[PDB]
Amino acid sequence: KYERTYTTQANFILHGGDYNPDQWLDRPDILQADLELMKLSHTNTFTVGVFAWSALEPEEGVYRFEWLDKVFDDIYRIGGRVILATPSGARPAWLSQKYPEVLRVNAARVRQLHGGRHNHCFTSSVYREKTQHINRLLAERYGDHPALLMWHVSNEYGGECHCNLCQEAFREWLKKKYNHDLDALNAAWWTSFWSHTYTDWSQIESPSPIGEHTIHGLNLDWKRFVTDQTISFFENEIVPLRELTPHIPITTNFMADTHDLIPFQGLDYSKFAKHLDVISWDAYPAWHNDWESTADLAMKVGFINDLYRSLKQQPFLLMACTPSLVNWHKVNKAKRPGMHFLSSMQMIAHGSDSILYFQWRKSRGSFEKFHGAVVDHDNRTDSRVFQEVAEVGKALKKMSGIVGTNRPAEVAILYDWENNWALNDAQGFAAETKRYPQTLVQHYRPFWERDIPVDVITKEHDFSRYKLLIAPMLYLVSEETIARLKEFVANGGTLVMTYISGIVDEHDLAYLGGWHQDLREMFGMEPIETDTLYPRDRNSVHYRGRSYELKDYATVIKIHAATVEGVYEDDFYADTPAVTSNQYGKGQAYYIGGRLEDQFHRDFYQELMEKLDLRPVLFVKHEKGVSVQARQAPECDYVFIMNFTEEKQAVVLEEKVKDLFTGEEIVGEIMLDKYEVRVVEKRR
Amino acid sequence: KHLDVISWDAYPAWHNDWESTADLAMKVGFINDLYRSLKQQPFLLMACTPSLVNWHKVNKAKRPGMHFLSSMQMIAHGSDSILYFQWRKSRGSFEKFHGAVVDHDNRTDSRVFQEVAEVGKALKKMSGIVGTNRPAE
Amino acid sequence: PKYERTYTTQANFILHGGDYNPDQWLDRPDILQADLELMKLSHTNTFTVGVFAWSALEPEEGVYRFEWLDKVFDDIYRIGGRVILATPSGARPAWLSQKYPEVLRVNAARVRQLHGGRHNHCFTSSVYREKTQHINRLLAERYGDHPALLMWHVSNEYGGECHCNLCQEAFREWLKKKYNHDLDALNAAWWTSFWSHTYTDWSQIESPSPIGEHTIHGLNLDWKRFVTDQTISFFENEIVPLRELTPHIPITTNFMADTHDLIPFQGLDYSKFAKHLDVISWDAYPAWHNDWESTADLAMKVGFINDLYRSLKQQPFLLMACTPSLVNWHKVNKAKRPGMHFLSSMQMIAHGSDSILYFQWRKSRGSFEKFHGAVVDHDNRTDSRVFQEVAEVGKALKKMSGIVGTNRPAEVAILYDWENNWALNDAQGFAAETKRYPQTLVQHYRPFWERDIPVDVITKEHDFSRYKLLIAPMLYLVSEETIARLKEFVANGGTLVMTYISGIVDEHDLAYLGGWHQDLREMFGMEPIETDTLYPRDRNSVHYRGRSYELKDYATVIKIHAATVEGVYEDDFYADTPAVTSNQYGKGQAYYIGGRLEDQFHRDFYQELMEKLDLRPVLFVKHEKGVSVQARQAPECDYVFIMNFTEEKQAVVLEEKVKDLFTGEEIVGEIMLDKYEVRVVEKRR
Ligand SMILES: [Zn+2]
Ligand SMILES: [Zn+2]
């Protein structure tokens, strides 16, 4: 057990990031300086060619690979490695001008002009041909270069196209999904409503603000198609990569939504993950903002990490972050001294085998010229950003034992992108209080405050290995998923569900005749009414001797065999069941009918931590704001003690451990400065 | 002037947090007094929800007793009908969560159904009100 | 040449009147006859005619109706009035749009507009440039030698842009000229290597768009430059027959302030347009009596804009439009209180205007601006408090002919740059809502306005040498040439003040590399190494002159060389590090302010400079805050305006004995000012 599983051939933590010398070809002095600064900053891995298509192919069929040949050799000579990217992220101007079909058509059916990035038509045969060919040339030339470590396919896949080519592709997709049965499609989408019944496949179109946007089934299936065809585009990209370089691992960088650090909503990453070799993503938390504590934000980062790592049974790769500040936030505030080191260590602690940045060197002009990078316009090593990057680099060098290490969890939180889509599109409840990913984080809080390892999983992930499965607001759920949940509980698993779960099937079709028999058996109860509240509306639930504030949502509950653990205290359903528990088979099922304050989640899950013996990898006594995360090797535990507060923090090491950096045995109480991290080692 | 009878659909945001129930009730009365006065006759409530709607910012359902209250108010201001959208909740698409007499669970046990029954039971005793007007000074 | 008068027109009096639209009342002889009578009673003598009269002049193509305008000319002339004749390109007739669709605009999203509104023509269209020049020539032929003609009013409030195919190719030609047909130089200037945007043919380049390219700053900046240049080109085409047939009739076009907080108009580089005009004119509509600022604060903002537009040509300017009561297009259209109109009118004169002109003379009966303020309301009454206060202004103006042509030299200058405003606003960085570049300049303007010290708000085309003190806040974009000029300015004895987020970028929005420009580093004896952008709730403070001042929005980590540390931060990770510095360079001095501090810092900091450089008002008058004292200077005397921009009575002390301009009595000592009361005062030299 605890066997190491490696994502790449590297036996060291990758350090570096996006490199962009194709912007500096007129400046050989800068290019030479780059190599020296890479040594000084202790960076070793660099992602090259993300937006270099116009530099590789300035005219159609005219190729310039020489500058890239030199970059490969130079990086390798200083002991570095290259993550080679496919350039599909931004088409050259000559391509858009000559082949207009690569330009997107938005939902309002407006054809776009050339500009920006990440905005190609995902159906266009021309762009599929062009991207695959340039990928083939790259694979042919650099495929066996010793510096090549990894493929970085495209850049931040996202967006939709509604052109005629995509409409036809969408129609063929629908024909396959519904086995050419128009009756089945009409039944699934309930198109009898508002006389929307389709009588020919040619009538079906993608959703539009100037067309049809009132059919949930259509909206949901469209999002599914967008994901499938994006993946299709990706598969077309990697055809020569698989042929010519089967041994080189393939990834594409995932995102978080531009807001609240919730999972990217544009693409079903759970489906995407199965086509990748390793998971990678770009993190840009708004550190030092004035609407939440540093700890709250860190908790959100930990949540996303626990989601993206759990997509595979292996470490992930932080493909991008900023060493200081970004350019596109409302308030572009830079990391305070110590914060970069702290955030980097957190990334490692949650399972990253890399600390990669955007950028290496700041672009001199254009949109992201003020985005953070290792090297500022001043070209100085004197910068506090450069110095802390170097500090991270030196730390990472001493942490090669952590590479490949996993970190098993007994607690799982179930997240579903299709559920997120359906719930967001649903007409009902309250639009601004749905907050499905945020609600999951609320159930993630007590475990993060208790340093208990959590996996945030999706439905194709195995449930059997976990003692505790939490599935808040599973509004959309299939009979197959339900059956697997029933099996999970019956075999001894503990399941927690909440208000607005199992309302709808995979077609956003409402379950009829009360709630599904399985869920009713498992939970020993059933919901009969969802009460949506106004911002000033309040209620409370009395549970284990305490009344907890309720907001936004409440559920009227019909009890069968379940035990009533909590009751409402106000409104017309006062003194009726609010929290339930039910023994089912060898396991147990809990239902939380209302959205309650943080303290409820702390106390409720405290009971389960005790009942199920849920413990941290290494117990460290500390106040709130201090996070303790560990990765587990066969011979030892690597534990990160991270102070996400602006205060000194007294923590207590109950067991003797060794500082990974100094080798010093430490035990008992120690003081942590602001943003200070202690990385300790504990032999089994 | 081109219609035989006036009819309208009423969807007041009952139990909101920016005004009293009385204020909202007053506004409902104003609209009723307007649409009734378009002709010299009773009007018809063509649609209202026995519980909630689907398209409000906050879709809060009527509290116990409010539906009976609102229905009686409609009659009082000159409506010779209590008609709902919808009879039975559609299983899918845009208004699958719009209020109806029958929920997705098909139960007469529902408080929505029982109160609709209370209203209809009261309406059967009020046929004398049918056709009556209400002159104003 | 000392304090020599500079006349903008052949008028030896202050112009009073405004936009007159008799073409809306041609079916009303009674109204037109009543106009002249009320004009006399209101003491108005100058009227802008024909601004939107194209359809009245040419109802159908080739069918002209000049008779009504002939009579208006002779009628205004009869009562001793003058005519500011306007070219009608501001609103094309419906037949013109229908017959020549190429004059219609195409917006940024590439949508062709339909006919409607105003000011929305294609500024490239050869047809529209031709038609507009034709009708201008006809006007110049028929009215050029009429004695009532005073000045040309070309078009109306130039603004907006077009993205049609004609404009696209015009933009490409403009780019070829600017970059010497060197596609390499263009790509290098815009840094198009980023996101693989490198252009390989000129045909690939197009104007920015929300559905196209909007992420290339160099393109966005050069596009705005092109919009200005081609607007100017359109203007130059309009005035060809004007220069030819009427070479001695001065030409102007009315400038604007932008919709909110009275900042300079951002649609056009007025610093470039000004050079193509004989005299500067602009339209002022301050939201008087609003509930988010004091009357004094708003008046200060008005003073700033006035000082800016006046300094563009160093001669009196002309208030082309203001409302005698209220406007129609504000969120809250509140009318001026009694006294306020007289007060604001006097403030215009005090800051260099040789005219008080209104929009409009008589209210429109219908359409968009029927509830806009005017001298004559819909009731056609003279009992109106609006009409009577207009008459009060006119009565006062007739006694102020000596002020006509007079200037007001300043020792203090604040540097403003439109292209800097553009590039800074488009930049991805800092905080979008707290950039506030022109508002920041006003904050540095405040201590001098409170001390009645004359200030010129200049642009980089303006000479620097004549000033003792030049303030250049947030000069984010600056060229090598400008830096050199600032260097020489300080070296020769000038005192320069700059702030956070200056000299980051050159005229291509290209970041300077290798730390800060050596010239700036030598001048200031220091260098900025990091800009700290803050959230709304973030706070810091700077210790300076034995006192702490609050800091918001922005701070700057500073590396000291030769400079003297005069202020240090007190919080965060750069606590007890330099925040305010001073440095001697050549005969002069350079100050750097690394943080955005409260108003009281600016008061104290600039008080030091007022003492050190001996900066005094023209005539010192003792008063509390809210009283503004501004002066214009003649060879023989100073005309001093004492204005109460508060809603309470105000005690004021005149030191030197002085002559009241209206009632020629001499006054001295304490004087009591009522609410909104203005005292116009004369001090012989
Ligand atoms: Zn497409
Ligand atoms: Zn055009």
Side-chain angles (χ1 to χ4, degrees), chain A residues 286-301:
Chain A
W287 298 110
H288 320 302
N289 65 74
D290 64 338
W291 62 73
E292 66 185 344
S293 72
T294 301
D296 291 326
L297 182 49
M299 186 184 58
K300 294 179 181 178
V301 178

Side-chain angles (χ1 to χ4, degrees), chain A residues 101 103-105 111 121-124 161-166:
Chain A
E101 72 165 58
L103 297 179
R104 271 183 179 173
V105 169
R111 177 80 67 172
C121 164
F122 50 75
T123 308
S124 160
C161 188
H162 301 256
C163 82
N164 55 314
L165 302 174
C166 294

